[PDB]
């Protein structure tokens, strides 16, 4: 069970995205090669105090 986040600030926050650098970490190779790369989890900030 997960809770959908809410925007609390004017600025946008960090998000995980596919870019030209990491494009081919998420698709197979010509001979079927596959990999799964590590992804971060706590991208958005929250105020401690």
């Amino acid at each position: 069970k997960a809770k959908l986040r809410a925007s609390h600030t004017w600025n946008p926050i960090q998000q995980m995205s596919i870019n030209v650098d990491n494009q081919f970490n998420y698709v197979p190779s010509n001979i079927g090669g596959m990999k799964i790369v590590y992804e971060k989890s706590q991208l958005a900030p929250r105020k401690l105090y």
């Epitope: 870019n19 030209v20 650098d21 494009q23 081919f24 010509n30």
Partner: antibody
């Protein structure tokens, strides 16, 4: 306008190693490949290595087993790592940009350097 | 794979100059040559693309063509600005190796 600046030249022993760096600006760095072309004193241009957006690299047969090239698109920088240098490697190395937009594994089918840097000198001797 | 160029070519002011680069079906027969200009001690400059186009600001004096395994660069209305060294560049698609020519020195009379 597109501008490139190199660095890293030095004098090393006949069996040492060295690393060079270029800094680029003025264009979509991730869309175009960057290449290392060298010129021995009094001789013609010679290609060394090239790297594309996703980290894919190509090396000439003269350096394929020794050298290594890399990028950092977040810093618009390209590096070349040379190992097991020999005297013949002595040359001024030029950093250039491709005219054509290629990103992934299937580049090096059409290359044309359209902008150039200033060059850095590599000397291999005792 | 390596490309072949003549060591030097000579022409007089106002005439036409031709520089020839020879390759193979593997390099020039698929991707035509691209021509570069190098003043003594300076960084090279691109003159004519593989398709005959020129970078912005290059005079129409410079032109190129491809036939079979050989390419040529034609300089028309030779001026004093053209005394330099010229190179042909092509890429081998079979091997993925970029090939330059040996270079040719241009003498203006």
């Amino acid at each position: 306008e597109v501008q490139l600046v190199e660095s890293g030249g030095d004098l090393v022993k006949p069996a040492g190693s060295l690393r060079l760096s270029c800094v680029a600006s003025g264009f979509t760095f991730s869309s175009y490949g960057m290449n290392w072309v060298r010129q021995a004193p009094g001789k013609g241009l010679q290609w060394v290595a090239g790297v594309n957006s996703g980290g894919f690299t190509g090396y000439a047969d003269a350096v394929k087993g020794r050298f290594t090239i890399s990028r950092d698109n977040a810093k618009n920088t390209v590096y070349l790592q040379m190992n097991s240098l020999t005297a013949e490697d002595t040359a001024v190395y030029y950093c250039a940009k491709d005219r054509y937009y290629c990103t992934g594994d299937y580049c090096f089918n059409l290359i044309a350097f359209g902008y150039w840097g200033q060059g850095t000198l590599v000397t291999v001797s005792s | 794979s390596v490309l072949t160029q003549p060591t030097s070519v000579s022409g007089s002011l106002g005439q036409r100059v031709t520089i020839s680069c020879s390759g193979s079906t593997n390099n020039i027969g698929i991707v035509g040559a691209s021509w570069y200009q190098q003043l003594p001690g300076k960084a090279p400059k691109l003159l004519v693309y593989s398709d005959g186009n020129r970078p912005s600001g290059v005079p129409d004096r410079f032109s190129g063509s491809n036939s079979g395994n050989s390419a040529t660069l034609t300089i028309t209305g030779l001026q004093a600005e053209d005394e330099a060294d010229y190179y042909c560049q092509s890429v081998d698609p079979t091997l993925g190796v970029v090939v330059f020519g040996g270079g040719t020195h241009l003498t203006v009379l």
